[PDB]
Scaffold this active site. Structure first.
Site, PDB file in Angstrom:
ATOM      1  N   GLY A   1      17.180 -18.878 -16.469  1.00  0.00           N
ATOM      2  CA  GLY A   1      17.719 -17.527 -16.378  1.00  0.00           C
ATOM      3  C   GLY A   1      16.663 -16.434 -16.327  1.00  0.00           C
TER       4      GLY A   1
ATOM      5  N   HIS B   1      15.886 -17.363  -3.939  1.00  0.00           N
ATOM      6  CA  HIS B   1      16.578 -18.603  -4.298  1.00  0.00           C
ATOM      7  C   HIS B   1      17.915 -18.372  -5.029  1.00  0.00           C
ATOM      8  CE1 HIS B   1      15.601 -18.931  -8.589  1.00  0.00           C
ATOM      9  NE2 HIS B   1      14.329 -18.634  -8.326  1.00  0.00           N
TER      10      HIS B   1
ATOM     11  N   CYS C   1      14.281 -16.101 -14.076  1.00  0.00           N
ATOM     12  CA  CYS C   1      13.873 -15.782 -12.699  1.00  0.00           C
ATOM     13  C   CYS C   1      14.170 -14.327 -12.368  1.00  0.00           C
ATOM     14  CB  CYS C   1      14.534 -16.724 -11.698  1.00  0.00           C
ATOM     15  SG  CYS C   1      14.288 -18.484 -12.066  1.00  0.00           S
TER      16      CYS C   1
HETATM   17  O1  LIG Z   1      12.505 -22.442 -11.416  1.00  0.00           O
HETATM   18  C1  LIG Z   1      13.626 -22.636 -11.864  1.00  0.00           C
HETATM   19  C2  LIG Z   1      14.817 -22.795 -10.940  1.00  0.00           C
HETATM   20  C3  LIG Z   1      14.321 -23.282  -9.596  1.00  0.00           C
HETATM   21  C4  LIG Z   1      14.205 -24.642  -9.333  1.00  0.00           C
HETATM   22  C5  LIG Z   1      13.572 -25.103  -8.192  1.00  0.00           C
HETATM   23  C6  LIG Z   1      13.056 -24.187  -7.307  1.00  0.00           C
HETATM   24  F1  LIG Z   1      12.374 -24.622  -6.224  1.00  0.00           F
HETATM   25  C7  LIG Z   1      13.187 -22.832  -7.521  1.00  0.00           C
HETATM   26 CL1  LIG Z   1      12.548 -21.708  -6.369  1.00  0.00          CL
HETATM   27  C8  LIG Z   1      13.827 -22.377  -8.658  1.00  0.00           C
HETATM   28  N1  LIG Z   1      13.865 -22.816 -13.178  1.00  0.00           N
HETATM   29  C9  LIG Z   1      13.149 -22.293 -14.279  1.00  0.00           C
HETATM   30  C10 LIG Z   1      12.132 -21.338 -14.196  1.00  0.00           C
HETATM   31  N2  LIG Z   1      11.400 -20.895 -15.227  1.00  0.00           N
HETATM   32  C11 LIG Z   1      11.642 -21.424 -16.417  1.00  0.00           C
HETATM   33  C12 LIG Z   1      12.643 -22.393 -16.668  1.00  0.00           C
HETATM   34  C13 LIG Z   1      12.805 -23.033 -17.922  1.00  0.00           C
HETATM   35  C14 LIG Z   1      13.758 -23.996 -18.093  1.00  0.00           C
HETATM   36  C15 LIG Z   1      14.592 -24.360 -17.046  1.00  0.00           C
HETATM   37  C16 LIG Z   1      14.455 -23.785 -15.815  1.00  0.00           C
HETATM   38  C17 LIG Z   1      13.461 -22.801 -15.576  1.00  0.00           C
END
Ligand SMILES: O=C(Cc1ccc(F)c(Cl)c1)Nc1cncc2ccccc12
Ligand SMILES: O=C(Cc1ccc(F)c(Cl)c1)Nc1cncc2ccccc12
Ligand SMILES: [Cl-]
EC number: 3.4.19.12
Lengths: 301, 305
Positions: free
Chosen positions: B143, B41, B145
């Site tokens: 951040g 992603h 990921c």
């Molecule tokens: O997972 C995402 C971005 C994203 C969004 C949709 C989606 F389908 C995919 Cl594959 C990736 N963000 C975040 C992940 N983990 C903690 C996080 C805490 C706070 C903010 C954002 C975080």
């Protein structure tokens, strides 16, 4: 989102763990530059444990009595000195993996990561707090002496603890990296007992703020309290008194969540009176006191 | 004495964390040999995230679109490919800090250490269990990921997880290092919900054995139970079924503490039907399920890495 007990990455400290052998005793040393630091009790026998004279025992030792092993390489000891309860073994090789470091003495309530080691090899990393009674509730077996507690300041490692001993209750006592014990403890087999432990109040409040930042709000109430009325209640539950410094330190979290410190203090008073009622706060059924205000801001923000 | 949630030493994994930037997105990569692994992603924008065709998006990218940074050194990408939900960026330099490693897919209940990273820099290490609903109750900010989950077996790092997303309930979802998601999750901005979670029964039993090894024995009772009677009770309290494999794995702890597995099950059965009664086990008022039997043995025996 989410809240976990999180340790600092241990890599910078793993590159410093060595094994120190003196006679029959084998424990861990911290190799920084050309010096290996370890508990001075490594020079002790069975008869010299109840009342050792460490100055007398160390004078009888020679550099060749200390066997230092960094991985599969034996390091040569070229000098030995004692600073309080820590032994300093000067070696002929500077640790190429020496990070940017500092020796810091911490106060009760402060948290740090422990890299538990056996035979100079790291086995695990976990998070601790210096208890108000100056003990640490660690997870240590025989051979763990010399395992260190630390924090990481961007690129810099602040070494704050070296494990020396286990008290009869299963709790642990040790020193800063200058060999000064935390608490009224001595490195002798003499009858020693930790003082009655108390809850680190400022840390519980910091953790209640972390819970609010994570969307847990059930414990909040319409009440506020005076600092003195809060301390009168808290003390009856064996909670540490909350000082004006603690209220000030909680300021940024208070501003971020919109809940004044004395308002959160009233929430805590209610929790002590009622308990959880089958509910949890951040997946815990007990009030957690091993996250400082600084830990909460770092992890949440 | 003492029992702590303990992660593996993270040093071998820290030497692998790099920062991967693609357009405006910056996340973490795992640099092993001459390959950098990261969530696919990273190539997505806001429109792309809603309904992404990753094959189409990656075909439009060139090697110079990926900015890989290992500390203060920029690595040059000489190839790119996709394996399921992970992007593989071939680089011109092999990581001199590459440890002995394997890519392993873990099962629910298994625990692993997570090295949370931001901008290719490790910020924290914590231990966690892959929940029976395939989520991890982690601690991650924007951040994070590309942060990885691992275990250490002797001198070998087994990479078992890479962080991809946060679900609406605050729990986390990710993949193994071959890009296969754990659970019924997809890497797309859409409505996704974790299934109702259950308690990892074998891990609770392992933790009750750890408590006995530490001198906490109040919950022990004279009773034993059949595996079928225990499972009927377990099902009722949203506890995972205990298999004969779990009973066998608990064998060494059973031998060490003199408490048979089905005897510890009668204690667990009573703890569920009656509660703690104001008492704690290892300083906890809840039954802890994020220590496997191997974690308990490792901690109460002193295995090093
Ligand atoms: O997972 C995402 C971005 C994203 C969004 C949709 C989606 F389908 C995919 Cl594959 C990736 N963000 C975040 C992940 N983990 C903690 C996080 C805490 C706070 C903010 C954002 C975080
Ligand atoms: O307690 C000692 C050694 C020792 C003994 C006496 C004495 F006065 C001093 Cl300064 C040191 N280190 C140990 C550390 N941690 C956990 C331990 C569990 C079991 C056994 C030993 C442990
Ligand atoms: Cl931290």
């Amino acid at each position: 989102s989410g809240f976990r007990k999180m340790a600092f990455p241990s890599g910078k400290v793993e590159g410093c763990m060595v094994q120190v052998t003196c006679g029959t005793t084998t424990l861990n040393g911290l190799w920084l530059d050309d010096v290996v630091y370890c508990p001075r009790h490594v020079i002790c026998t069975s008869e010299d444990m109840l009342n050792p004279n460490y100055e007398d025992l160390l004078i009888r030792k020679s550099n060749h009595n200390f066997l230092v092993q960094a991985g599969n390489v034996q390091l040569r000891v070229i000098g030995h000195s004692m600073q309080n309860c820590v032994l300093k073994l000067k070696v002929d090789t500077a640790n190429p993996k020496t990070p940017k470091y500092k020796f810091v003495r911490i106060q009760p309530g402060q948290t740090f990561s422990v890299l538990a080691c056996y035979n100079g090899s790291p086995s695990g990393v976990y998070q601790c707090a210096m208890r108000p009674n100056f003990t640490i509730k660690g997870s240590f077996l025989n051979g763990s002496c010399g395992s260190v507690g630390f924090n990481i300041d961007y690129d810099c490692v602040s070494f704050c603890y070296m494990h020396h001993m286990e008290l009869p209750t299963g709790v642990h006592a040790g020193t800063d990296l200058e060999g000064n014990f935390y608490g009224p403890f001595v490195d002798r087999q003499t009858a020693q007992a930790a003082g009655t432990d108390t809850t680190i109040t400022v840390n519980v409040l910091a953790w209640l703020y972390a819970a609010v930042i994570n969307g847990d709000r059930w414990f909040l109430n319409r009440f506020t309290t005076t600092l003195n009325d809060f301390n009168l209640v808290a003390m009856k539950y064996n909670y540490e008194p909350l000082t004006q410094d603690h209220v000030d330190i909680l300021g940024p979290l208070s501003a971020q969540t919109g809940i004044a410190v004395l308002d959160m203090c009233a929430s805590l008073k209610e929790l002590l009176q009622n308990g959880m009622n089958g509910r949890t706060i951040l997946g815990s059924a007990l009030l957690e006191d091993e996250f400082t205000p600084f830990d909460v801001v770092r992890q949440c923000s």
